From a paper:
O-Demethylases belong to the class of cobalamin-dependent methyltransferases that catalyse methyl-group transfer from a methyl donor to a methyl acceptor via a methyl­cobalamin or methylcobamide acting as a reaction intermediate. Bioinformatic studies propose that CobDH is part of a multi-component O-demethylase enzyme system.
CobDH was crystallized in the presence of methylcobalamin and the structure was refined to 1.5 Å resolution. Two CobDH monomers were found in the asymmetric unit. The overall high-resolution structure of CobDH reveals two domains that are separated by a flexible linker. The N-terminal domain (residues 1–82) folds into an antiparallel four-helix bundle. The C-terminal domain (residues 90–212) resembles a typical Rossmann fold with a central five-stranded parallel β-sheet surrounded by six α-helices that forms the binding site for the methylcobalamin. The corrin ring and the central Co atom are presented on the surface of the protein, while the dimethylbenzimidazole (DMB) base protrudes deep into the central β-sheet region. His102 forms a coordination bond towards the Co atom from the lower axial site, which results in a base-off/His-on cobalamin-binding form. No electron density was observed corresponding to the long linker region which connects the two domains (residues 83–89), suggesting a high degree of flexibility within the linker.
Residue numbers in the entry: 1 to 81, 88 to 211
The structure:
Amino acid sequence: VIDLNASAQAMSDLDEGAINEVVDKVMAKADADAAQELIKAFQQGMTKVGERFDSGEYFIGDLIFAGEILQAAMDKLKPALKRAKIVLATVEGDLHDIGKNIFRTMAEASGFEVFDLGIDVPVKIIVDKVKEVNPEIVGLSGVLTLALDSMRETVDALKAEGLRNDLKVIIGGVPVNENVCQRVGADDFSTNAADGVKICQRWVG
């Protein structure tokens, strides 16, 4: 670009004018390597959206916005240019998916292939999907205590099938924290969907 750090800031600020000004400049010079640098800068800015949510400056709506804004930039940058895979579910006992879907949108916009299994998803169905597609990451959503139990059951089933050690497990949902992460047997838990993407990007290469 002219200025990658300013472009990261523009994503952080959710400034559609500035984001599209730079996307246009990059698309004009038709350099794949420059487009990839801009993408990385936008991804860094997504992380900053999460930090701004965690501070209380930004709200749920801003997280919805961020995902949609990143995806729109990615769609424009695609002409100028093997995805890591995530199997994603709201687990058995739970019908809450607003949050999971915020994450799904951010993860899709960040170049992951996401297999969204939907809500109230039985353990056995999650495990069958992991056998089928061999994802790098399994992401599990829930809030009710029964759901948190189903998270633990899903990890235990992956261990029984010899699948656990070759993937990473991330959990999210209203009540998740380090204590729930430990009880479940997950690798990490998210504070917010943008933090979760940050985690997942670190795991993949």
